[PDB]
Amino acid sequence: DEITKKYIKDNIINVDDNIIKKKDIFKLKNENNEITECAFEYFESKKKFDDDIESRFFIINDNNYNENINLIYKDIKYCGLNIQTTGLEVFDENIRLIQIAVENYPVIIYDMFNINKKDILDGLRKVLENKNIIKIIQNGKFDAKFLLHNNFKIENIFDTYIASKLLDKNKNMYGFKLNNIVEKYLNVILDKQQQNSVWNNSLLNNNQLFYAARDSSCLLKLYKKLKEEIKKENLHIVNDIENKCILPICDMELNGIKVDLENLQKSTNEILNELNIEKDNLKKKLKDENINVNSQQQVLKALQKNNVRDISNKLIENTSDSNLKNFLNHEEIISLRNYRRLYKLYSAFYLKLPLHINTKTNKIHTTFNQLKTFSGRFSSEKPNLQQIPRQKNIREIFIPNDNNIFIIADFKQIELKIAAEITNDEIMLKAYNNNIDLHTLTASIITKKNIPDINKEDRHIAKAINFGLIYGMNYVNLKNYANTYYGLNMSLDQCLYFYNSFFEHYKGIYKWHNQVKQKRALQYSTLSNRKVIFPYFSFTKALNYPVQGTCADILKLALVDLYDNLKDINGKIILCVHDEIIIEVNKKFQEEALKILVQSMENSASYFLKKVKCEVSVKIAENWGSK
DNA sequence: GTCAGTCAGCTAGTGCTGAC
DNA sequence: CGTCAGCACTAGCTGACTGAC
Ligand SMILES: Nc1nc2c(ncn2[C@H]2C[C@H](O)[C@@H](COP(=O)(O)OP(=O)(O)OP(=O)(O)O)O2)c(=O)[nH]1
């Protein structure tokens, strides 16, 4: 059949027909600013669509490429970019189709698999690398990862997804595909009924490419309607900062962090042997052999028939640590808690890491998402590296590459600094500029001791109670916030005394608490001005959103600045979890990397917070687990 | 010889339960 | 709190073991 093979020469199979070739005029601008009447072939659909979204497109094959098409990109200010891939695993998937939507022109689509010369793509690379031109990508993370992997460079992003979700204010957490936003903001239906059609095949059908072009083309009108809204609410700053953190996250994902195989295997052997002997000990201790040692109800029944009683002689009803922490008297309970802690560590960490280690490179690669979190913080997906245990300093399994070196840094008490900025309290400014940690000052006011006498044991109470009441936490509940968590223990009278004392001096915190309680607004804001709306008033969330949001924003600015500066020495940003940036560099450059890091984070802090200085604790470590 | 009816193993799902 | 993983229990599905006139 010639009808299906009508345009087979361009590597397109005409499955559904419904297209027609066209060769018309295009008035481009010559490099000498001379208007030239160059003509370009372009296909079009016979069946029209009711929407105004553009649907035309040129296919530029190696045998069909012409130099004059490159003139179209001249003088532009922005363009679209939609990339098609054969799969989701970036390390082992090949970029199929790269579209560009240039305004008042059809979408240029590069059939990559048929492009066998480097002289074609460099025209696209020059556009991608220039910072003066803005780029628009739906979910820019994925396309940026694939591009950077395959030897491209893209130097400006305007993620419509980020603008949409920041305008959503975390009201609806789903419905952010391209169709959703396009319907909500453009009154157009894209008809994305493509059920993930076959892509690895060299030949491609007409419907697939035509619908792919529209998904690329619609983004320009979406950007025009989005920039007006984002400027309307004065959310320009947050969008500007958030768009530039796409590239650092991409570099973290593509680099990842290496894992030591031999150390991990050795650790598995020792922990497994210890688990076996301890499980045998427990099974002996329970006085019965049929018990499945894991089951909560079975072990609870075993304890109950073993006559395990509390201080008041009452039988145990729960195995919760918050309940079992007070029942340390029994010999069996110590072994039981030991067993369960060891099993949690084993299953969570040692059986899980071998599943997520790439044998091809011996590296672990996370998946990072930025606005997925309520407060806007980073969340580590798949291997949740926010979840790697801190016990034993298990991070020594992780290491840098064969010859490089880790240089980690972290903010020292960023959260309380943000509180100091927002509340405008004189005492916290006094303490900070006098070079005294707010934990130390809190301990001093609690104990009324002289300044150097704030020992670690005393400072623990301050460290707990500060974070306790800085978020408006009930003084009755401080007993429960202590008895179960951290290492505090008190009574009601002392709870009341501490609650009175803290707000006796920290006038700013009291004022902030009273106003946040009174207003009861459905909306709250940060220093970076990101906006969120809660379904109903809630004291704890209402207090916690601004401080932690600004803390996240400072880290994001630090990340973009660090990407900007590190390029000279070929540095790479590896991981960041909780106010802690980890970079990597080959030896002989450490003396410079330390300075670049501290300067970048200092400028980051100086941008947002003016009154109070920052203080960055920096260390250079052979392994992530260095003390 | 055959086919309902009750007996199921299994599959899924919500409930509930401990962990840094 | 958030998260994830892990385990009973309860209820519905898809074939095997009868029971028969
Ligand atoms: N108990 C508790 N811990 C949380 C919660 N969310 C996060 N965390 C963890 C991760 C945070 O990084 C950590 C708070 O302690 P940090 O590690 O930030 O300590 P800090 O920077 O004060 O360290 P330093 O005093 O210098 O040793 O607690 C939560 O809701 N409850």
XYZ file of C-alpha atoms (C1' of nucleotides) and ligand atoms in Angstrom:
699
model
C 0.000 0.000 0.000
C 1.414 3.356 -1.082
C -1.051 5.288 1.099
C 0.606 4.084 4.301
C 4.007 4.349 2.564
C 3.085 7.727 1.060
C 5.783 9.656 2.978
C 7.887 6.694 4.102
C 11.070 8.406 2.871
C 10.908 10.778 5.864
C 10.744 7.747 8.209
C 7.038 8.394 8.914
C 4.450 5.656 8.365
C 1.078 7.096 7.334
C -1.080 4.844 9.491
C -4.195 6.997 9.942
C -3.624 9.298 6.917
C -5.238 12.655 7.882
C -2.121 14.667 6.915
C -0.992 16.558 3.820
C 2.383 17.912 2.725
C 2.780 21.636 2.077
C 5.642 23.805 0.773
C 4.986 27.519 1.355
C 6.978 30.687 2.011
C 8.638 31.838 5.238
C 10.088 35.359 5.508
C 13.137 34.837 7.711
C 15.869 37.346 8.594
C 19.376 36.914 7.210
C 22.436 37.212 9.445
C 23.061 40.564 7.725
C 19.509 41.599 8.745
C 18.386 41.099 5.128
C 14.838 39.815 4.721
C 15.015 36.539 2.790
C 12.202 34.587 1.131
C 13.224 31.054 2.047
C 10.633 28.286 1.656
C 10.321 25.262 3.952
C 8.293 22.092 3.527
C 5.710 21.563 6.251
C 3.011 18.959 6.811
C -0.468 19.662 8.156
C -3.512 17.705 9.294
C -6.489 17.412 6.967
C -8.901 17.107 9.913
C -8.914 20.417 11.767
C -9.214 20.829 15.540
C -11.503 23.360 17.198
C -8.703 24.756 19.376
C -6.319 27.583 18.492
C -3.258 25.593 19.606
C -0.714 25.276 16.811
C -0.327 21.853 15.189
C 2.040 22.327 12.216
C 5.583 20.959 12.209
C 8.655 20.409 10.045
C 10.664 17.183 10.147
C 14.408 17.804 9.776
C 16.130 14.582 8.719
C 19.836 14.264 7.995
C 18.953 14.029 4.296
C 16.352 16.829 4.673
C 18.299 19.304 6.829
C 18.896 22.743 5.332
C 21.069 25.509 6.743
C 18.471 28.268 6.320
C 16.110 26.740 8.911
C 18.607 27.804 11.588
C 17.740 31.449 10.871
C 14.346 31.040 12.582
C 15.853 31.129 16.080
C 17.340 34.597 15.507
C 16.220 37.363 17.904
C 13.812 35.133 19.866
C 13.351 35.669 23.602
C 11.762 32.350 24.565
C 10.838 28.982 23.114
C 9.211 25.692 24.003
C 11.008 22.408 24.535
C 9.331 18.991 24.722
C 11.544 15.901 24.594
C 10.383 12.355 23.851
C 12.241 9.345 25.253
C 12.018 5.594 24.727
C 11.681 5.006 28.472
C 11.838 6.363 32.001
C 15.283 5.072 33.077
C 17.507 7.938 31.961
C 20.777 6.048 32.400
C 19.751 3.469 29.769
C 17.268 5.225 27.465
C 17.809 7.214 24.271
C 16.253 10.573 23.416
C 13.778 10.109 20.569
C 12.287 13.463 19.531
C 13.236 17.030 20.509
C 10.666 19.733 19.730
C 11.043 23.513 19.793
C 8.054 25.880 19.714
C 9.108 29.277 18.345
C 6.391 31.897 18.378
C 4.382 32.543 15.183
C 6.099 29.539 13.607
C 5.506 25.781 13.451
C 7.228 23.482 15.914
C 10.607 22.242 14.672
C 10.980 18.549 15.580
C 14.337 16.773 15.264
C 14.101 13.062 14.469
C 17.229 12.249 16.452
C 17.591 8.616 15.379
C 17.985 9.628 11.712
C 20.345 12.556 12.451
C 23.804 11.094 11.807
C 25.830 14.340 11.724
C 26.942 16.743 14.442
C 26.536 19.686 12.047
C 22.744 19.642 12.544
C 22.318 19.700 16.325
C 24.830 22.466 17.099
C 22.256 24.964 15.855
C 19.988 23.730 18.636
C 22.819 23.644 21.174
C 23.691 27.300 20.599
C 20.096 28.218 21.437
C 20.083 25.925 24.467
C 23.323 27.318 25.926
C 22.620 31.045 25.585
C 21.267 32.417 28.854
C 19.459 35.304 27.162
C 16.771 32.968 25.763
C 14.184 31.504 28.132
C 13.116 27.865 27.780
C 9.775 26.336 28.741
C 9.532 22.680 29.798
C 6.635 20.747 31.304
C 8.413 18.888 34.115
C 11.801 20.319 33.189
C 13.607 17.857 35.462
C 13.214 14.868 33.149
C 14.101 16.598 29.883
C 17.020 18.403 31.516
C 18.397 15.129 32.898
C 18.173 13.416 29.518
C 19.762 16.379 27.723
C 22.670 16.777 30.148
C 23.330 13.039 29.976
C 23.452 13.038 26.154
C 25.989 15.880 25.820
C 23.826 19.001 25.624
C 23.674 22.100 27.807
C 20.556 24.095 28.700
C 20.951 27.410 30.505
C 17.467 28.711 31.368
C 14.228 27.006 32.421
C 10.658 28.221 32.954
C 8.868 25.155 34.328
C 5.140 25.641 33.807
C 4.636 22.864 36.360
C 6.392 24.876 39.068
C 4.353 28.008 38.382
C 1.118 26.022 38.289
C 1.735 24.153 41.535
C 2.939 27.279 43.342
C -0.249 28.987 42.179
C -2.198 25.962 43.455
C -0.962 26.699 47.000
C -1.074 22.970 47.838
C -4.875 22.927 47.582
C -5.083 20.002 45.139
C -2.088 17.657 45.139
C -3.032 15.808 41.909
C -4.117 16.873 38.439
C -1.035 18.636 37.075
C -0.433 16.893 33.763
C -0.263 19.105 30.689
C -3.942 18.505 29.919
C -4.974 19.538 33.429
C -3.179 22.888 33.394
C -4.146 23.563 29.776
C -7.813 22.966 30.580
C -7.701 25.026 33.778
C -5.853 27.986 32.199
C -6.570 27.929 28.428
C -10.033 26.353 27.891
C -8.626 23.862 25.376
C -8.665 20.052 25.291
C -5.433 18.500 24.014
C -6.931 14.989 23.593
C -3.941 13.089 25.009
C -5.499 9.714 24.236
C -2.079 8.339 23.262
C -1.770 5.231 25.450
C 2.047 5.305 25.395
C 2.366 4.177 21.794
C 5.438 2.256 20.648
C 8.493 4.526 20.495
C 11.611 2.370 20.074
C 10.595 1.654 16.469
C 12.466 3.782 13.940
C 9.389 4.492 11.832
C 6.733 6.624 13.518
C 3.027 7.100 12.849
C 1.300 10.364 11.977
C -1.009 10.700 14.993
C 1.824 10.213 17.467
C 4.049 12.965 16.061
C 1.153 15.341 15.395
C -0.166 15.070 18.954
C 3.408 15.357 20.241
C 3.839 18.687 18.450
C 0.729 20.189 20.057
C 1.966 19.305 23.542
C 5.064 21.325 22.615
C 3.217 24.215 20.956
C 0.608 25.003 23.609
C 3.260 25.933 26.172
C 3.839 29.420 24.767
C 0.292 30.661 25.333
C 0.358 28.889 28.688
C 3.494 30.854 29.577
C 1.896 34.111 28.452
C -1.082 33.467 30.739
C 1.164 32.144 33.539
C 3.610 35.044 33.739
C 0.731 37.501 34.124
C -0.665 35.540 37.073
C 2.693 34.925 38.747
C 3.489 38.651 38.514
C -0.015 39.538 39.730
C 0.530 37.994 43.186
C 4.130 39.266 43.542
C 5.327 35.650 43.512
C 8.044 36.626 41.011
C 10.880 36.061 43.499
C 9.882 32.512 44.412
C 9.417 31.486 40.783
C 12.769 33.021 39.852
C 14.609 31.149 42.604
C 12.737 27.879 42.076
C 13.324 27.702 38.325
C 17.100 27.827 38.761
C 17.239 24.919 41.235
C 16.143 22.491 38.508
C 19.683 22.185 37.155
C 21.396 21.530 40.537
C 18.901 18.768 41.321
C 19.630 17.300 37.900
C 23.369 17.305 38.563
C 22.814 15.629 41.931
C 20.670 12.934 40.321
C 23.098 12.264 37.462
C 26.091 12.162 39.806
C 24.534 10.494 42.834
C 26.648 9.075 45.646
C 28.813 5.964 45.410
C 28.396 2.979 47.741
C 31.158 0.717 49.062
C 30.290 -2.873 48.180
C 32.838 -4.624 50.407
C 31.956 -2.630 53.524
C 28.241 -3.195 52.912
C 28.691 -6.959 52.555
C 30.838 -7.124 55.699
C 28.235 -5.149 57.640
C 25.553 -7.542 56.418
C 27.549 -10.513 57.693
C 28.076 -9.088 61.184
C 24.542 -7.748 61.591
C 23.060 -11.014 60.290
C 25.099 -13.165 62.672
C 24.148 -10.894 65.564
C 20.494 -11.051 64.490
C 20.599 -14.845 64.408
C 22.096 -15.195 67.881
C 19.763 -12.553 69.334
C 16.707 -14.182 67.739
C 17.736 -17.492 69.289
C 18.158 -15.743 72.641
C 14.701 -14.184 72.392
C 13.031 -17.434 71.340
C 14.605 -19.041 74.390
C 13.437 -16.117 76.536
C 9.798 -16.228 75.398
C 9.559 -19.827 76.726
C 7.897 -21.059 73.515
C 9.052 -22.149 70.060
C 6.039 -21.510 67.795
C 6.075 -17.715 68.174
C 6.698 -15.744 65.013
C 9.092 -13.277 66.624
C 7.954 -10.412 64.367
C 4.194 -10.431 64.988
C 3.006 -7.729 67.375
C -0.031 -9.683 68.561
C 1.855 -12.971 68.922
C 4.700 -11.434 70.927
C 2.179 -9.458 72.986
C 0.390 -12.722 73.795
C 3.737 -14.321 74.649
C 4.531 -11.518 77.088
C 1.024 -11.657 78.566
C 1.228 -15.402 79.213
C 4.744 -14.762 80.561
C 3.150 -12.483 83.212
C 4.771 -9.186 82.225
C 3.350 -6.369 84.363
C 3.868 -2.625 84.700
C 4.748 -0.572 87.786
C 1.060 -0.651 88.774
C 0.971 -4.462 88.234
C -1.196 -4.001 85.119
C -0.757 -6.279 82.122
C 0.789 -4.761 79.002
C -1.605 -3.829 76.193
C 0.833 -2.298 73.666
C 4.425 -2.853 72.544
C 4.866 0.838 71.704
C 8.218 2.257 72.746
C 6.396 5.265 74.205
C 4.735 2.662 76.453
C 7.670 0.231 76.688
C 10.229 2.953 77.476
C 8.982 2.948 81.086
C 9.009 -0.879 81.375
C 12.775 -1.413 81.224
C 12.755 -3.471 84.441
C 11.968 -6.805 82.775
C 14.927 -8.784 81.457
C 13.027 -10.052 78.411
C 11.851 -6.598 77.323
C 15.427 -5.373 76.869
C 16.147 -8.244 74.481
C 12.809 -7.720 72.725
C 13.495 -4.045 72.023
C 17.019 -4.933 70.919
C 15.647 -7.526 68.517
C 13.061 -5.199 67.018
C 15.528 -2.340 66.571
C 17.974 -4.675 64.847
C 15.252 -6.051 62.562
C 14.069 -2.559 61.638
C 17.624 -1.554 60.751
C 18.251 -4.771 58.800
C 15.087 -4.761 56.700
C 15.097 -1.005 56.108
C 18.756 -0.650 55.118
C 20.761 -3.770 54.321
C 18.166 -5.730 52.345
C 17.128 -2.543 50.529
C 20.454 -1.064 49.384
C 21.474 -4.028 47.157
C 18.171 -3.617 45.300
C 18.969 0.024 44.424
C 22.698 -0.212 43.598
C 23.577 -0.051 39.908
C 26.061 -2.839 39.222
C 27.104 -1.058 36.019
C 28.623 1.829 38.009
C 28.357 0.902 41.719
C 26.461 4.111 42.480
C 23.117 4.799 44.163
C 20.797 7.258 42.396
C 17.833 8.832 44.168
C 14.833 10.665 42.749
C 14.391 14.187 44.120
C 11.176 16.213 44.164
C 11.016 19.796 45.401
C 7.430 21.066 45.719
C 6.095 17.585 46.538
C 6.559 18.444 50.222
C 3.980 20.518 52.087
C 6.529 23.058 53.350
C 8.358 22.934 50.003
C 11.428 21.054 51.224
C 13.367 18.420 49.329
C 12.160 14.826 49.563
C 14.269 11.839 48.528
C 12.203 9.312 46.566
C 12.701 5.600 45.915
C 15.784 5.333 48.238
C 14.627 7.914 50.765
C 18.065 9.176 51.743
C 16.382 11.287 54.395
C 15.696 7.852 55.953
C 19.207 6.335 56.062
C 19.848 5.475 59.742
C 22.152 7.716 61.757
C 23.045 4.910 64.197
C 26.625 3.495 64.084
C 27.400 6.280 61.600
C 26.263 3.918 58.854
C 27.280 6.572 56.304
C 30.831 5.172 56.274
C 29.510 2.643 53.745
C 29.017 5.583 51.391
C 32.276 7.075 50.113
C 33.490 9.556 47.463
C 34.876 8.330 44.160
C 38.253 6.650 43.820
C 40.401 9.774 44.312
C 38.013 12.641 45.134
C 37.144 14.002 48.582
C 33.911 14.980 50.320
C 33.569 18.515 51.676
C 30.320 18.892 53.634
C 28.808 22.070 55.075
C 25.699 22.885 57.086
C 23.895 25.863 58.577
C 24.285 26.154 62.348
C 20.777 26.699 63.754
C 19.098 28.127 60.656
C 15.551 27.588 61.959
C 15.981 29.809 65.002
C 17.730 32.420 62.841
C 14.684 32.539 60.570
C 12.528 32.916 63.670
C 14.778 35.781 64.785
C 14.277 37.536 61.469
C 10.512 37.059 61.287
C 9.588 37.901 64.874
C 12.034 40.828 65.264
C 12.940 40.101 68.895
C 15.680 42.237 70.433
C 17.055 39.557 72.759
C 17.755 37.026 70.005
C 19.540 39.661 67.921
C 21.592 40.617 70.985
C 22.583 37.003 71.649
C 23.385 36.292 68.000
C 25.555 39.361 67.417
C 27.256 38.707 70.767
C 28.302 35.285 69.385
C 26.276 33.068 71.732
C 24.198 30.162 70.462
C 20.499 30.547 71.198
C 20.632 27.093 72.763
C 23.195 28.486 75.202
C 21.069 31.557 75.941
C 17.966 29.430 76.500
C 19.925 27.215 78.888
C 21.168 30.299 80.734
C 17.697 31.764 81.225
C 16.403 28.340 82.281
C 19.145 27.613 84.829
C 20.081 31.229 85.706
C 23.733 30.101 85.681
C 26.722 32.163 84.582
C 27.488 32.222 80.859
C 30.358 29.703 80.399
C 28.654 27.255 82.788
C 26.269 25.991 80.055
C 27.475 22.396 79.950
C 26.250 19.827 77.435
C 23.955 18.127 79.951
C 22.340 21.468 80.763
C 22.368 22.504 77.101
C 20.289 19.438 76.174
C 17.248 20.854 77.975
C 17.639 24.127 76.086
C 18.101 22.311 72.774
C 14.833 20.448 73.300
C 12.698 23.202 74.828
C 13.699 25.788 72.203
C 12.355 23.777 69.268
C 9.489 22.816 71.564
C 7.932 26.234 72.138
C 9.189 28.064 69.035
C 6.221 26.527 67.163
C 3.514 27.232 69.749
C 3.463 23.877 71.511
C 1.099 23.294 74.419
C 2.632 23.453 77.887
C 0.500 20.516 79.006
C 1.779 18.584 75.985
C 5.413 19.387 76.813
C 5.251 16.439 79.212
C 4.299 14.203 76.284
C 6.788 15.944 73.987
C 9.459 15.010 76.570
C 8.527 11.615 78.025
C 8.445 9.958 74.588
C 10.914 11.972 72.487
C 14.491 13.245 72.861
C 15.791 12.783 76.451
C 13.690 15.031 78.676
C 11.560 14.211 81.711
C 9.597 16.663 83.851
C 6.406 17.283 85.827
C 3.495 19.673 85.396
C 4.784 22.454 87.663
C 8.138 22.533 85.876
C 6.343 22.539 82.528
C 4.449 25.652 83.611
C 7.610 27.289 84.949
C 9.524 26.760 81.705
C 6.555 27.918 79.628
C 6.305 31.134 81.628
C 10.069 31.711 81.580
C 10.526 31.295 77.822
C 7.873 33.862 76.900
C 8.920 36.118 79.791
C 11.999 37.229 77.811
C 11.321 36.146 74.214
C 8.737 38.857 73.607
C 8.883 38.370 69.850
C 7.860 34.722 70.024
C 4.903 35.558 72.287
C 3.779 38.393 70.014
C 4.080 36.152 66.952
C 2.090 33.395 68.666
C -0.692 35.760 69.710
C -1.053 37.333 66.260
C -0.900 34.015 64.395
C -3.609 32.692 66.713
C -5.808 35.781 66.359
C -5.748 36.230 62.579
C -6.804 32.646 61.726
C -6.188 33.432 58.060
C -6.788 30.820 55.386
C -3.484 31.984 53.821
C 0.066 32.310 55.159
C 3.276 33.588 53.575
C 7.060 33.323 53.806
C 9.950 35.756 53.443
C 10.450 34.332 49.952
C 6.687 35.031 49.594
C 5.570 31.541 48.533
C 1.878 31.218 49.321
C -0.093 28.346 50.862
C -3.755 27.964 51.829
C -4.887 25.502 54.500
C -8.386 23.964 54.481
C -9.015 25.349 57.975
C -7.133 27.106 60.746
C -4.549 24.965 62.529
C -2.174 26.441 65.079
C 0.894 24.244 64.595
C 0.941 24.317 60.794
C 0.148 28.038 60.770
C 3.221 28.719 62.886
C 5.540 26.239 61.208
C 4.984 27.111 57.546
C 6.895 30.448 57.343
C 10.002 29.502 59.302
C 10.678 26.177 57.612
C 9.676 27.518 54.200
C 12.237 30.309 54.460
C 14.797 27.769 55.663
C 14.125 25.736 52.518
C 14.396 28.839 50.337
C 17.808 29.765 51.743
C 19.102 26.269 50.970
C 17.736 26.506 47.424
C 19.494 29.833 46.847
C 22.688 28.325 48.245
C 22.347 25.468 45.771
C 21.968 27.734 42.734
C 24.893 29.924 43.786
C 27.056 26.856 44.417
C 26.264 25.515 40.945
C 27.181 28.915 39.503
C 30.551 29.100 41.253
C 31.795 25.483 41.298
C 32.117 25.245 37.501
C 35.776 26.322 37.512
C 37.188 23.310 39.395
C 34.726 20.728 37.989
C 32.905 20.270 41.275
C 29.780 18.173 41.701
C 26.955 18.477 44.232
C 26.151 15.048 45.648
C 23.401 15.115 48.284
C 21.419 17.409 50.554
C 18.901 16.192 53.154
C 18.474 18.530 56.162
C 20.258 21.900 55.979
C 23.399 20.047 54.897
C 25.093 20.351 51.489
C 27.551 17.665 50.352
C 29.857 18.372 47.405
C 32.715 16.424 45.837
C 35.946 17.358 44.061
C 39.197 15.758 42.984
C 42.153 16.272 45.304
C 44.523 19.276 45.098
C 41.548 21.695 44.947
C 40.129 21.365 48.490
C 41.669 24.624 49.737
C 39.675 26.446 47.046
C 36.470 24.424 47.407
C 36.190 25.261 51.106
C 36.272 28.986 50.345
C 33.901 28.758 47.374
C 31.422 26.824 49.522
C 31.473 29.187 52.486
C 31.258 32.275 50.271
C 28.353 30.878 48.248
C 26.319 29.977 51.317
C 27.161 33.310 52.970
C 25.863 35.271 49.978
C 22.820 32.981 49.970
C 22.055 33.902 53.572
C 22.775 37.591 52.991
C 20.239 37.809 50.155
C 17.187 36.899 52.243
C 18.105 37.651 55.875
C 19.657 41.071 56.524
C 19.709 41.728 60.273
C 21.340 38.510 61.525
C 24.514 36.882 60.241
C 24.863 33.207 59.370
C 27.460 30.792 60.732
C 28.445 27.797 58.607
C 30.064 24.733 60.158
C 32.395 23.240 57.537
C 34.436 20.034 57.558
C 36.407 17.982 55.035
C 35.763 14.250 55.231
C 37.265 11.182 53.592
C 33.841 9.549 53.945
C 30.310 10.836 54.539
C 30.548 9.263 57.989
C 33.390 11.416 59.325
C 32.771 12.661 62.855
C -22.359 -39.401 32.430
C -23.453 -35.249 34.044
C -23.976 -30.639 36.746
C -25.268 -27.557 40.879
C -23.962 -26.445 45.776
C -21.079 -26.191 49.150
C -16.148 -26.537 50.446
C -12.205 -24.326 49.628
C -6.930 -21.394 48.432
C -5.890 -17.128 46.973
C -6.178 -12.357 45.941
C -7.161 -8.048 47.194
C -8.131 -4.518 50.419
C -8.634 -1.688 54.786
C -7.093 -1.873 59.879
C -3.830 -1.780 62.735
C 0.719 -1.739 64.237
C 5.741 -0.312 65.484
C 10.144 2.429 63.959
C 14.994 7.683 63.632
C 3.737 14.577 62.596
C 4.642 13.413 58.340
C 6.505 7.448 55.413
C 7.199 3.264 54.368
C 6.794 -1.611 55.260
C 4.792 -5.591 57.434
C 1.463 -8.428 59.265
C -3.767 -10.589 60.531
C -8.536 -10.697 59.173
C -12.420 -10.387 56.537
C -14.839 -10.820 52.248
C -15.302 -12.123 47.360
C -13.514 -15.054 43.091
C -12.603 -19.478 40.448
C -12.439 -25.081 40.449
C -12.648 -29.705 43.285
C -15.322 -32.948 46.075
C -19.184 -34.845 46.764
C -24.846 -35.759 46.183
C -28.333 -36.934 43.570
C -32.329 -39.047 41.103
N 11.683 14.426 66.622
C 11.609 14.884 65.366
N 12.707 14.945 64.617
C 12.454 15.427 63.376
C 11.242 15.834 62.858
N 11.395 16.268 61.550
C 12.672 16.119 61.306
N 13.378 15.615 62.372
C 14.815 15.331 62.464
C 15.643 15.750 61.252
C 16.157 17.120 61.674
O 17.332 17.490 60.963
C 16.463 16.852 63.141
C 16.609 18.077 64.013
O 17.948 18.123 64.598
P 19.220 18.636 63.753
O 19.920 17.448 63.176
O 18.789 19.714 62.816
O 20.174 19.292 64.880
P 21.082 20.613 65.014
O 21.223 21.250 63.675
O 20.556 21.421 66.153
O 22.513 20.018 65.414
P 23.654 20.359 66.508
O 22.973 21.035 67.672
O 24.666 21.252 65.837
O 24.240 19.021 66.884
O 15.343 16.054 63.580
C 10.076 15.766 63.660
O 8.917 16.092 63.363
N 10.366 15.267 64.931
